[PDB]
């Protein structure tokens, strides 16, 4: 069978990403259908909302793919990837980091996967100018969206046979948001003792993190350290250019996305990384239960990348990333 | 002759301090330590406690501290001192070998609002808000201080990291009084980095950095992953300022707990940061000789405690030091 996927090209360097990892999937002859239709416009009626093209898409297709869309700094628009994780109750955010055998870093066989919060946190998009010159940004802690992570990750640590889960926070100095963060771990870690648990401070993560990640696994933060500590480790195994991540909700409906952003530096030129994109959509297939063709289309950049002589620019490379995807499609192919 | 006012803190903060006196003492250094206990101490006693340290500054305008702990102590104490900038320096140690070898960096982080003020509140049953503050006369004066530090220490870039594209309001503020004031430098290159962005390119590639300018958890979160980068804490030192006073710190503040009764704990990071201090009381000749016998006993790499890759113990570690420093002091 067929089935149709809602794609969201979005801003900067997200329309040749998506180009190219579209054009893998025609060459791995996926059983795959685009219903293209653009998020990246911000429309306000008081409230602010998804364009209903894009909306109907979702609440049809419930499979994403999607590209960056940019956020203006201190100005514009909220983030609409904030909109989207919000509107189609996107809470759980899944961002594997493993090492990519092929391409050399400092760092070997890193395999953590950073589950974070997706909904509440200090990615609330309330803020308040309390005087002239005193602003007041609002974080958001609650024990249902607490507790729903954590049974997720512990969930999540099953399906994929990790054997422990850190809860990451910084309840010494958020007592009582991070302190129910926190509570609402241990009381799932306590119901799921097939999994060992633990916990951490942040700071601690990322002073340990960069000195030595074998002492990880699954990790579990709300929004803001989730977010941080993800790219942190994208650091670790190439960059920005191949990490993947998936929001996913209740009911199977979710939203694959590579960690990046924008990349406003790169965007006119052919010099992106689509592996990121790319290896979103191979969680993607595995997510529709395509797991053949998600082996091949991940087998084939792997190889591709373990090769050489076609790199991108970001991981050592001249090859600009059409002829970096042209070689991961003719490898597919055979 | 100097009077120097000591907070041991939590933790191995009073066995690093002693490495500090044992250290001092051979070098002869002419500092005179003015103890205060303020970890941990009980509540009522707190506010009187705090006074003292307040008033013995007054009179000796430096310190050498631990790490402590309505709002904590470590915020009630900065906020009495006014100590509202940070500043940690990540510096490769020449026989220290990390992933990022040859690295120099300053990290200036301010550290009297945002997250930090423990101004929180349960709105529903389950419903937590936590308010982070940020204000332009804050903002204002630490964006002032990186710069002031880049055009003091001669250096050239000074890049401000916020998360300003989803928190407008509170990180603009922030982002836009560094903008205002990168102005007023107009020798001092400014640049501007989305935090997550930042900590990638910390690990990937931290040598284009330079300085950087961050409000209270972001520099929390920097302060680590950079000290991680250079051999950790035990290794990192930092120092925090007001108008009038200096206290030395370590650089990515831990108590190591685990470590305490244990002779496992690293006193590189606080003997270094006393050096720094020892530079601050305009005693170089003392500050210049105890730190590069540290890096010596480093370098050479007979004794080294188990963060960095030996087996001495804390003791061990601070009397190979104290040999060398007393010969140096002869020679
Ligand atoms: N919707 C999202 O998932 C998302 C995520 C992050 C940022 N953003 C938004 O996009 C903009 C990004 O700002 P930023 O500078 O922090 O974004 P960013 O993640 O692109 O960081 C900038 C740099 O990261 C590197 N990089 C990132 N992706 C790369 C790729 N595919 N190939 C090669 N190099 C790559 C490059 O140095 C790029 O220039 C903001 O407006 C922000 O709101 C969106
Ligand atoms: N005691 C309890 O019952 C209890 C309960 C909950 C939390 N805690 C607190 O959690 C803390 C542990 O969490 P943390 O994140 O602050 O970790 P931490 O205090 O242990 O410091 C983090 C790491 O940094 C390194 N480090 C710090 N100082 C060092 C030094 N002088 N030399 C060499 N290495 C050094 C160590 O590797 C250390 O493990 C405890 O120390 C404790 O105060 C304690
Ligand atoms: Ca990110």
Redesign the interface.
Known sequence: GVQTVTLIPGDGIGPEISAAVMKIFDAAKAPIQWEERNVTAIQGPGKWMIPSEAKESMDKNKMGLKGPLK?????GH??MN?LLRKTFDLYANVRPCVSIEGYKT??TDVNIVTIRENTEG??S?I???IV?????????????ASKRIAEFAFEYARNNHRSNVTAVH?AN?????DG?FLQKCREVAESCKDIKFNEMY???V??????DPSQFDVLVMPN?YG??????????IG??GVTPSGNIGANGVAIFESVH?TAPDIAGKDMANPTALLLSAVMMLRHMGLFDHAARIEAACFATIKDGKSLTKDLGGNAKCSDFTEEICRRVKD | SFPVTMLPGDGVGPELMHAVKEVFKAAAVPVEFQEHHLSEVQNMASEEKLEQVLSSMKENKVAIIGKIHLASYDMRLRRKLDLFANVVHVKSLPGYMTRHNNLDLVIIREQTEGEYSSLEHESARGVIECLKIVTRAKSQRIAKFAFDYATKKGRGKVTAVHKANIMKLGDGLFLQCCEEVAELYPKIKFETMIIDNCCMQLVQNPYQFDVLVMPNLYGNIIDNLAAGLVGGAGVVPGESYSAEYAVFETGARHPFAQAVGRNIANPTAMLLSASNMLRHLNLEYHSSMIADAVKKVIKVGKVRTSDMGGYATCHDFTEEICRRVKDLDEN
């Open positions: 956020t203006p700094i201190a100005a909220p983030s904030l400092p760092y200090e990615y998009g803020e308040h100018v002239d010159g005193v602003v007041a940004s609002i974080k958001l802690i609650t024990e249902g910084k100095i958020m007592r009582m948001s129910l942040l700071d601690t990322c002073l340990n993190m960069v000195q803001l977010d941080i500590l993800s790219d942190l480790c994208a650091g670790l960059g920005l952003g």
